[PDB]
Amino acid sequence: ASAWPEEKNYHQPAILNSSALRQIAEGTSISEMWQNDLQPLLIERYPGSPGSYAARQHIMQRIQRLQADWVLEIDTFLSQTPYGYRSFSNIISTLNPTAKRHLVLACHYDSKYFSHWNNRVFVGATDSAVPCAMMLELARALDKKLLSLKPDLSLQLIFFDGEEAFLHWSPQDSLYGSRHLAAKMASTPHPPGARGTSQLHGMDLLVLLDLIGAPNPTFPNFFPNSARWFERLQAIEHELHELGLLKDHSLEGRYFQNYSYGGVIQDDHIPFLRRGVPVLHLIPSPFPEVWHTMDDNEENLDESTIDNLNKILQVFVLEYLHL
Amino acid sequence: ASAWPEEKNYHQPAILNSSALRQIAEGTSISEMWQNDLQPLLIERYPGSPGSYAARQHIMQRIQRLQADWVLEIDTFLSQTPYGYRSFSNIISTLNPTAKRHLVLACHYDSKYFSHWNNRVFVGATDSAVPCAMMLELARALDKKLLSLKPDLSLQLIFFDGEEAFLHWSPQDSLYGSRHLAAKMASTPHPPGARGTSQLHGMDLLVLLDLIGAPNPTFPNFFPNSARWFERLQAIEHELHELGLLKDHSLEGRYFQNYSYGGVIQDDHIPFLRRGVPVLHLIPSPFPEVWHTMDDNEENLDESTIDNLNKILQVFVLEYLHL
Amino acid sequence: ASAWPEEKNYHQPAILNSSALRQIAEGTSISEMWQNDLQPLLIERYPGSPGSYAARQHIMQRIQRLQADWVLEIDTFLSQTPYGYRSFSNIISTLNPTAKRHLVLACHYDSKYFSHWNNRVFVGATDSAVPCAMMLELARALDKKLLSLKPDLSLQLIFFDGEEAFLHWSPQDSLYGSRHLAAKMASTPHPPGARGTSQLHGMDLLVLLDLIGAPNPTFPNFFPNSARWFERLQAIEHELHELGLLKDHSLEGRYFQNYSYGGVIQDDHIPFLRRGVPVLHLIPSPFPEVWHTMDDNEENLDESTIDNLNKILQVFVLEYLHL
Amino acid sequence: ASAWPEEKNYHQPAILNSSALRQIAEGTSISEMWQNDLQPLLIERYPGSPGSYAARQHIMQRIQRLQADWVLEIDTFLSQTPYGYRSFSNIISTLNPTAKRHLVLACHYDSKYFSHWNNRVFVGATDSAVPCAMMLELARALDKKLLSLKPDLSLQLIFFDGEEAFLHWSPQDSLYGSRHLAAKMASTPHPPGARGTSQLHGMDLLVLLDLIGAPNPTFPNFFPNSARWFERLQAIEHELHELGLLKDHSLEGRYFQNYSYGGVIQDDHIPFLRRGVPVLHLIPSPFPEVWHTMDDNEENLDESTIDNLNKILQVFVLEYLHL
Amino acid sequence: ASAWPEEKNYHQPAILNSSALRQIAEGTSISEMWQNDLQPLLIERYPGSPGSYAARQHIMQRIQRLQADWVLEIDTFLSQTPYGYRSFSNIISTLNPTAKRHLVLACHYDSKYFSHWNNRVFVGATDSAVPCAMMLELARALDKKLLSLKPDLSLQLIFFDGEEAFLHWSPQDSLYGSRHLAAKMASTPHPPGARGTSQLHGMDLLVLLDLIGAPNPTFPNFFPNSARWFERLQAIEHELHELGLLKDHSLEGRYFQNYSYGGVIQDDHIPFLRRGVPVLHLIPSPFPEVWHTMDDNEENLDESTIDNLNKILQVFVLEYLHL
Ligand SMILES: CC(=O)N1CC[C@@H](Oc2cccc3c2/C(=C/c2ccc4[nH]cnc4c2)C(=O)N3)C1
């Protein structure tokens, strides 16, 4: 158990400049996101459905066609549920799997099982297709900058499956994808041949996106081992603003407002947190008004707020990686 | 059973008049403390390190040298960890071991474990060297009125070991010391020969200090079985200020604000709280900015604040103990 | 990682010579042990009642009066049961506490509780009065041979409390005493100051006696890590017979029969097995006839078999201890 | 607490003389059982199937036509399974339910789910349709005597649903009906209005029949708390053969041989045994050659064996109840 | 669900003729085993020792040079131990991975970690160096016959790691390598693409070889869904004797004898058994004399007992696989 797993604790960012930041804002397109990356996912897609495979497919296509060398794996597994053994599949996409340290972005790509009602279907526009698209669009924008990876640090995306409960929310029935992936990663030497260090050691920070796409989001600072990273998002939000690069956005309505949170949301991060992974949980409090209703559709998304979180996060992420 | 162990539920304090308030203030020296109590604790001191031992025996010499008849104990023990079985030594110092009831104050004397970075070392000034000292200095400062214990009630201190995770925070890898001492008290009869009542029945209240020493702390009222004692820590801070006995202090920066908390903090009280001991958790929210970084050093400690908290705590203990 | 613990897997007895075997046979007096070692125990002695103390006392009075330097310990403690919390008191007797390693002979000194039926009172002469006696006597016998101890190893007795169950044999309501103590020793550095060796690594072997004193008994060989000590006991029952020291004893009616068993029996050894100590369980299969019936008394004990084990024992010991 | 829950270990059988033993043998018809109680049960009857329903009703019509005052009780419940929730229905037949104590005879009436193989259906003839019919036959053979039940003791028959696994014998896929009903009685005050005693304290003994029907069975002795009672079946087996009342039976090929066993057999007793119930577990070791094969049909039964066991059992039972 | 998971209750062997039974017995070489399959492996090889790697290296090399199209999987995982986190590596040799069902043979290729005592090093000869060799020979003896495999069924060999506890046998310390793969398998759908079936379904029977090399072993029949398959061992044994193709072989001391065991030995099957797999636990009972003692070496092995089992075994496998 060397010392590299503690570098995370001293990692510091490579702050960008007004000129770079300008380049970053102009290099992301919320409309190409909307059509190419997000509209394909707005379909029923609970675990094991045909939706799950169409969306699982859409995702890999969008990643497969970019220049950076993304090592997609599919992590199909079996688990009991209240309706019996079902088959889930997580999507992991790694740059430099051999890099010892990674920064991770993660969301969930299942949609909650619901029966149809008045012939509408639940599709989870904010829970969590926008997150999925955000991530996909971030690899698409930052592609040329992400070739530069050929500090030992790289980037992983993760699209978890079975996040949502099948029937009735509880530890036995939720977060099926993650730990799984947690427990699996916890028990896989890293780097290879390592002897005491798991892939979780190498997880520098896990940025979980969830419930994004409604208007007027407020993200809290949930955890102390990541507060400094949360503060970098505050600073980025503020700068992109002062340079004029955010859209319909005022500071009296920031997204990253410093406000500690009492309790804990259960979400895919809990399997990695209770293994001492640092988590930046970008889930808003309060949830959207359209949470878990058939109105979590596209009509009710805010394109401005997503373009904005996209700029911020893209920036966050290149400064993390010293790119 | 008996009726003695509900007495905690009715205990009123013996409130001090202005004139004693001024003596108590006069009577604690933050400069003494800093030099004689705290500075020696500012070393790398994790469980089973030499620092640990250094730190451990020092505590005891500061209690040994006082005139009150404190009864040290080293409850040394062994426990499994992510790096093997290791050894841990609590420290307990009681007045009147047979006194049925006891006001207990506690903190933690270990330091998290960190590799050395840029030749820098983690010493944990807030976490929890200062609270260790504050407790020493309380007993120095109060020695003479404590001697008055030759309501069957006396005073206990506890310096827990192993609070901190070795690798990654988790109910398996944390709170070693208290989880041990909690079970061991749940399992010890008291007073000797009683047949249905344990030491934990005679913890009237557990006052736990943690992460104290930084500028501008704010302490929530975490529990309701202990709220009314928080209200007393509030009426004490008030009156000591309204009398010009606090330094660099304004009421628009109170330490104890009547804000309740949502979630919960894992700390060395958990094992006593889910066993029905009342807790006054004096941990601030938010945490110090320097928490679990190398900057948690002496340079970054607010001496004015600590001195102010020394006075509040010393008053509290006396009005509880009817001294 | 020193290696003191593995010595127990290399330890070979100082097999005795027939001459010696005679003496030992002549040294134990089934009518003294009946006289005083045991008839005091034949009382109603469930944990907590008057009987329990008396018996506790009796046990001590009798070890105290032997010239070997026996260190006694009461380990009183509290635990939850189906009638509430109640108080229990183990009994540990050691020579050379420091004697890093140890051979341990355990039995249980309580009596199951029962109401008074017909006007009869349970007493558990086989469960486990006799095993107690048999250990006392073993002391009173080999006394002079023990004194030798001022490879380093010595002999500890143990007389667990509340093995029996207050209501329903259920893991929650049984073995109060061993369950406790195995946790306790499983967390106690041994020797003083060790950093990774608990008092259980110091148990070379545990010999537990239970349900002894009824006629024609058989003792299976349940545990591989301890056969070889079983074997030693076949031989020590063999030789001693073929030399006529054994009264009323035929080799078709052996005690230590070739006869592996399959399942486990739940007894005070479970706490110490789980954690990986070696055990020689001398409980018979099947149980005595009078089992948990008011007929478990003296009436029904066969003076001859007892003495005839009481002897195979006192040997086996001495052969363990190279004495 | 009260004293009556302890009656079960002092309770003695009223032995039957040579003439009463005839009157029991002469009192059951293996052919009336075969045709009227057992052939109706030789259908596919996994839980929820149409056979489960047909069986339930047969068992209740057979018991309804008897003169004695049976109380039937369909305790229908829901429980997770490897295919989702499925309903199960246990059948409980009870004499004098106020009666505080009860000897309890039980089997299972489901069949294991299989998929047709060779155009063959599993009907489980030993597993356990024959035990079911044994209990209806006794109910009949012994009616007039049971009708005497207008010590405080009576009898109950219990037919479990879903004993067997749906997919893989595993703690969570098995014993659906007895894990349930155990748990239920464990928490039903009995007698009514009581305050510390559960229906399970009323279980004097649980005689569980299972896997009966093949030829040449050997039943081992499983539980020291019931060996006295397994001895009483050995005796009955002996006497009935001494008197000529058993057919095709050699004291060589006895059924109740006193060869104790080692490990446990998972079956509808586990739920009741681990909650401290005394159990007589009539299940052969080894298991019929035809076990969980399609060949476990009526062709490979043995009429003489069942009739011989029918006569033992009825006798034991009657002796238990003093009739 | 499908039907093939059931195909295992219905499988029967392709029994061999006396003429064929002769070829096999000649087709094995007990010597070109010893010098080329077994000697390489008698080395300190506790998990992670440079022996482990050699062993793992050796095994692979040997299977690799065979004609059959075996697919080796090294499944290196990480797990917690009483010395911290160590890196295990299971060996998984398979024919026709797709082969939905598989008959599996398995042993454990680790050696228990012992210090060095009087300069002697524990190589475990019967535990389980020999087993692996048996398995390796077996695939060198039948290689030609296995090629036949390009009813849907083939062969898999599993050499576990980490069977042996590191300190003191216990749930948490033991079977590192099979606990882990059992679960890895219970959650991998099989065959690819499946929706509700786990690679453990595809496990027809697990034959576990453990503790094989002493003279005069007595293998009991532990489990009944395998008993039928145990009886195929008796009949092969018997038969190969009636033509004395064996050696030093009696019938007064055959290996597989009609003597059920009581309970269970903990070994690498538990993890599979408790998910309802079928096990042929070819572990003798009682264990060898040289068990967990430094004399489990090449000098207390019985060349002849092994060449025989090697023949019994090898046959059985052809009869299972209709070759
Ligand atoms: C304030 C808040 O929002 N939360 C939720 C997370 C939890 O704290 C942690 C989160 C991540 C890593 C952590 C800890 C944590 C908690 C903690 C609590 C008390 C402490 N006293 C001294 N160091 C101490 C450390 C620790 O040791 N490592 C409290």
Ligand SMILES: CC(=O)N1CC[C@@H](Oc2cccc3c2/C(=C/c2ccc4[nH]cnc4c2)C(=O)N3)C1
């Ligand atoms: C507004 C707020 O602050 N909170 C705390 C957690 C959450 O808890 C719930 C409470 C009751 C029923 C629930 C859930 C809940 C939580 C949840 C958390 C994260 C999610 N991401 C996508 N769907 C997700 C669902 C869920 O699915 N069903 C609400």
Ligand SMILES: CC(=O)N1CC[C@@H](Oc2cccc3c2/C(=C/c2ccc4[nH]cnc4c2)C(=O)N3)C1
């Ligand atoms: C509001 C809040 O912030 N919290 C956190 C602590 C928790 O409550 C307790 C803390 C300490 C001792 C306690 C209880 C507590 C809680 C409780 C909750 C609901 C109740 N309804 C009626 N009595 C009731 C009692 C209780 O009974 N004993 C509620």
Ligand SMILES: CC(=O)N1CC[C@@H](Oc2cccc3c2/C(=C/c2ccc4[nH]cnc4c2)C(=O)N3)C1
């Ligand atoms: C399958 C098997 O081998 N066993 C052991 C006996 C039986 O255990 C019981 C079952 C039901 C009620 C029981 C007990 C039981 C066992 C027991 C074990 C050790 C004892 N030492 C002294 N009395 C003692 C009593 C007891 O006290 N009450 C299961």
Ligand SMILES: CC(=O)N1CC[C@@H](Oc2cccc3c2/C(=C/c2ccc4[nH]cnc4c2)C(=O)N3)C1
């Ligand atoms: C050590 C020993 O004697 N054992 C091991 C467990 C036990 O039985 C099994 C072993 C492996 C798989 C099994 C079952 C098993 C047992 C069982 C017991 C009672 C039954 N009554 C009807 N079908 C019934 C099925 C079952 O369904 N699947 C025998």
Ligand SMILES: CC(=O)N1CC[C@@H](Oc2cccc3c2/C(=C/c2ccc4[nH]cnc4c2)C(=O)N3)C1
């Ligand atoms: C089945 C049973 O009743 N028992 C009682 C003792 C226990 O065996 C042990 C006791 C102490 C330390 C031990 C082991 C033990 C047992 C065991 C079982 C299978 C084995 N195969 C190879 N070594 C193997 C070792 C082991 O590996 N380390 C087995």
